[PDB]
Amino acid sequence: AQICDEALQYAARLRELEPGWSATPGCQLHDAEQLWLDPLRAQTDETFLQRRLRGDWPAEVGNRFANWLNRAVSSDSQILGSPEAAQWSQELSKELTMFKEILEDERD
Amino acid sequence: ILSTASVLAFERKLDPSDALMSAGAWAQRDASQEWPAVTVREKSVRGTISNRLKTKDRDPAKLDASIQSPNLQTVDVANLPSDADTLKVRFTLRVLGGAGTPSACNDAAYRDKLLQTVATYVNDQGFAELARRYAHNLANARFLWRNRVGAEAVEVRINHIRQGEVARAWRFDALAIGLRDFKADAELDALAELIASGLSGSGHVLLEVVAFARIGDGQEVFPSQELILGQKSKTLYSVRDAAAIHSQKIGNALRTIDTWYPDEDGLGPIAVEPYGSVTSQGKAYRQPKQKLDFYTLLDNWVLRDEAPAVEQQHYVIANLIRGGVFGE
Amino acid sequence: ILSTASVLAFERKLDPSDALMSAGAWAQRDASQEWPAVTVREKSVRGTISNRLKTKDRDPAKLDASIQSPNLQTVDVANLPSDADTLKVRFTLRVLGGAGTPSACNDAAYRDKLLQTVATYVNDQGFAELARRYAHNLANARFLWRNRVGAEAVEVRINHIRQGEVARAWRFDALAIGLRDFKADAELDALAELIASGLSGSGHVLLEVVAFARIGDGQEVFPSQELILGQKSKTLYSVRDAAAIHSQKIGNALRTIDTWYPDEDGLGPIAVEPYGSVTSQGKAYRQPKQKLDFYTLLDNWVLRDEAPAVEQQHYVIANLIRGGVFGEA
Amino acid sequence: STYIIKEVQNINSDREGVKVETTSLTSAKRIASKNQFFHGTVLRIESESGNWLAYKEDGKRWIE
Numbered sequence: 160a161q162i163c164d165e166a167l168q169y170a171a172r173l174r175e176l177e178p179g180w181s182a183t184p185g186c187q188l189h190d191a192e193q194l195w196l197d198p199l200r201a202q203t204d205e206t207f208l209q210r211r212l213r214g215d216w217p218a219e220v221g222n223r224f225a226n227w228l229n230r231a232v233s234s235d236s237q238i239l240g241s242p243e244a245a246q247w248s249q250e251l252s253k254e255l256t257m258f259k260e261i262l263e264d265e266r267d
Numbered sequence: 268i269l270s271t272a273s274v275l276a277f278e279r280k281l282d283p284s285d286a287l288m289s290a291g292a293w294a295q296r297d298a299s300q301e302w303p304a305v306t307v308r309e310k311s312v313r314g315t316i317s318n319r320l321k322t323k324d325r326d327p328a329k330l331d332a333s334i335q336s337p338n339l340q341t342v343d344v345a346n347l348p349s350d351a352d353t354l355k356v357r358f359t360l361r362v363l364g365g366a367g368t369p370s371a372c373n374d375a376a377y378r379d380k381l382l383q384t385v386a387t388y389v390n391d392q393g394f395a396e397l398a399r400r401y402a403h404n405l406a407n408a409r410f411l412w413r414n415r416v417g418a419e420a421v422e423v424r425i426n427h428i429r430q431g432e433v434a435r436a437w438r439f440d441a442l443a444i445g446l447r448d449f450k451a452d453a454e455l456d457a458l459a460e461l462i463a464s465g466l467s468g469s470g471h472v473l474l475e476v477v478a479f480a481r482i483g484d485g486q487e488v489f490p491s492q493e494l495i496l497g498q499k500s501k502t503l504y505s506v507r508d509a510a511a512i513h514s515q516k517i518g519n520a521l522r523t524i525d526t527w528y529p530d531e532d533g534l535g536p537i538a539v540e541p542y543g544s545v546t547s548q549g550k551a552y553r554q555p556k557q558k559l560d561f562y563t564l565l566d567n568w569v570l571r572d573e574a575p576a577v578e579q580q581h582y583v584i585a586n587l588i589r590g591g592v593f594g595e
Numbered sequence: 596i597l598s599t600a601s602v603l604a605f606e607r608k609l610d611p612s613d614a615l616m617s618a619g620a621w622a623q624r625d626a627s628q629e630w631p632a633v634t635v636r637e638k639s640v641r642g643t644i645s646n647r648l649k650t651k652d653r654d655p656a657k658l659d660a661s662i663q664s665p666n667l668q669t670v671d672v673a674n675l676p677s678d679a680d681t682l683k684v685r686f687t688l689r690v691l692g693g694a695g696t697p698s699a700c701n702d703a704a705y706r707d708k709l710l711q712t713v714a715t716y717v718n719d720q721g722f723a724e725l726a727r728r729y730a731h732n733l734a735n736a737r738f739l740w741r742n743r744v745g746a747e748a749v750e751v752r753i754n755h756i757r758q759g760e761v762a763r764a765w766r767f768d769a770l771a772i773g774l775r776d777f778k779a780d781a782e783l784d785a786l787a788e789l790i791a792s793g794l795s796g797s798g799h800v801l802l803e804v805v806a807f808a809r810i811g812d813g814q815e816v817f818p819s820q821e822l823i824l825g826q827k828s829k830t831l832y833s834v835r836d837a838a839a840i841h842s843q844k845i846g847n848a849l850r851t852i853d854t855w856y857p858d859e860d861g862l863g864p865i866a867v868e869p870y871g872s873v874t875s876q877g878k879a880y881r882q883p884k885q886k887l888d889f890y891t892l893l894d895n896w897v898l899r900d901e902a903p904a905v906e907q908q909h910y911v912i913a914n915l916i917r918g919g920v921f922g923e924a
Numbered sequence: 925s926t927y928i929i930k931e932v933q934n935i936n937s938d939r940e941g942v943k944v945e946t947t948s949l950t951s952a953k954r955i956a957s958k959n960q961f962f963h964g965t966v967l968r969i970e971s972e973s974g975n976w977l978a979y980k981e982d983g984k985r986w987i988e
Contacts, residue, residue, distance in 0.1 A: 187498040215336050237657055284813040285674055359811045363745040373877035471747040473811055494639035494825045507677050541645045544662050554655045591645055924963045
């Protein structure tokens with residue numbers, strides 16, 4: 160839980176400090192991250208920015224976070240069939256569920 | 268007693284080069300040169316979520332939501348020119364030799380024992396069996412993985428380059444040659460003899476293999492996908508604006524000879540690899556529990572001088588020819 | 596007592612430059628200019644589990660599990676152009692001279708004794724033997740480690756540049772010349788004399804070596820792999836978007852003259868290195884226990900003025916020519 | 925405590941080392957000094973992971 164808590168605080172401080180973010184390079188896997196911090200539509204911009212983001216739910220953030228944590232924390236291959244692997248997967252799933260739920264209400 | 272060397276390496280032999288590809292008409296098969304190359308291109312591909320659902324079946328409401336947010340993806344595809352019904356693949360092959368000669372060994376006694384065993388095996392019987400097996404793979408189109416499937420006519424031409432000039436040419440048919448059965452032929456025997464000589468070190472050997480497969484007008488080839496590492500999920504390997512196949516990807520098929528695996532031979536040939544691992548099958552034949560393992564066989568035939576069955580000896584020689592890293 | 600100076604250094608001699616590579620047709624060999632260099636590229640490679648597993652884990656399930664998740668790895672390979680059957684390598688070589696001249700010495704007596712011993716050795720016999728040995732290595736392709744193996748025709752051309760032009764050219768055959776046997780030839784003798792003169796300090800010597808090896812169309816060259824740190828675990832040495840071989844990697848093979856190694860069991864020429872260390876063989880001949888050790892021989896021939904056998908003296912002079920750091924804390 | 929003892933010419937290098945499996949660092953240090961195989965090498969003690977524990981130059985005292 161503390162990992163998700165410290166993670167959400169970073170996004171909150173980012174949205175509360177940066178007025179916005181324009182187009183940036185490396186949008187292949189970073190498209191889901193840009194949807195975490197959503198600035199307001201500019202006065203000189205068009206009405207197709209919020210329209211496309213309104214009908215799109217942030218669901219790739221959970222996958223990117225799960226893969227990031229999986230690569231950050233090391234595990235043993237032979238231990239996959241052990242009792243520890245089951246509890247580890249259960250904890251990661253329980254955390255990912257609340258994490259995805261927190262962002263689900265963000266766009267909605 | 269005699270122990271093994273913690274560091275052992277064997278340079279690979281029979282190392283081929285990249286395989287270039289081109290397109291042409293069967294009528295113009297004689298004019299193989301000057302055929303234009305296939306240039307990779309990008310196209311937008313939009314697809315839904317076909318992944319298997321999780322253990323807990325969700326409500327159907329969420330499913331309809333995914334349709335409202337399609338997944339945009341860009342991939343790379345390679346298709347033959349507007350007017351071309353035959354694909355051409357050209358790749359060279361060299362025979363270095365000295366398979367048994369170890370590249371590096373910590374202990375001299377082990378190296379001497381290995382060279383002695385290799386010389387003894389060669390004197391008893393030559394590599395003609397391995398050369399004959401390789402000849403069949405080179406003759407047939409086993410090198411192609413997906414391009415061969417669904418082909419009208421496949422024609423292979425294996426030439427021999429000596430001092431820069433063509434010495435002896437050969438023309439075979441992959442379709443006529445059995446995929447799961449090996450048959451004897453005068454040309455196959457001649458090629459096997461040439462390969463055995465090259466491996467033994469009787470002289471330089473260079474063989475240029477060129478295949479022509481009839482696929483169809485505007486068909487789509489299947490080159491080797493590269494690592495993604497422009498939101499491109501699929502990147503096709505391309506050199507000099509031309510599609511090609513990886514050297515190892517070619518040498519694996521060209522080395523798919525071993526068929527004496529512990530199984531009943533229900534499938535086709537399996538490439539010599541440690542632990543008899545298979546990517547497609549997802550299983551590993553010749554498990555370490557059995558005595559047929561390459562490491563166990565070599566350790567026994569070296570320390571205890573126990574010569575295993577001719578089949579096991581052939582498999583061990585093939586592994587040494589392929590080369591690798593052993594010991595610790 | 597004339598104890599050895601705690602700080603001793605000898606600048607290396609016979610320091611060559613980088614070796615550029617290119618491709619071309621064996622026919623055009625006479626005209627080789629403006630050839631495009633070979634650029635390194637990356638290609639995805641799907642590995643497998645080939646490592647030798649221990650006896651602790653024998654469960655077959657574990658092996659099948661690893662095959663489920665393959666090990667993705669990225670490497671770098673260099674292949675000749677689409678239409679090219681001959682590889683070309685070009686590298687220069689310079690002869691500085693003053694091998695025995697020490698770069699830095701704490702005690703003057705030691706430096707004077709060393710210079711005296713060197714002058715005495717040169718007067719008794721010249722470096723013609725070392726020059727002749729180096730000539731064979733330069734003529735043949737022994738400098739190549741894997742490119743030479745499996746070659747149809749290797750042709751070496753050693754030129755001589757005095758004022759910046761082509762003064763005297765030489766053309767040899769690495770295949771015809773024995774790899775494990777040294778034979779005398781008029782050209783080899785002339786080259787050895789030139790090298791001996793340069794080392795003695797008779798004048799500047801610059802030799803441009805260019806080799807042409809027949810490999811095959813679209814073949815893959817084996818340049819010097821760089822050090823790392825899908826993560827790329829193999830980095831090929833490349834300069835100016837062109838493949839090349841390390842200067843030290845070339846100078847190491849070029850100095851494979853020493854053949855008096857105590858083993859004398861078919862190993863053949865071994866690179867001149869202290870303690871006769873060999874990476875490939877994994878064995879270090881000329882161990883310190885024997886009197887043939889370089890340090891022991893030099894210490895004896897300096898403090899006790901004991902001149903060892905001509906072979907040992909040649910090996911010691913070769914080490915001094917290569918240069919290095921000696922002494923102790 | 926598994927400690928990897930390595931030897932290199934300069935503090936900056938990547939050479940393998942022996943695993944002492946000693947109780948404390950002082951033991952590994954005394955062992956490296958007593959068994960030092962070279963005069964001008966720079967002793968580098970590191971844990972089982974890639975983290976550098978300490979280094980000692982030829983003419984300098986132990987440093988962390």
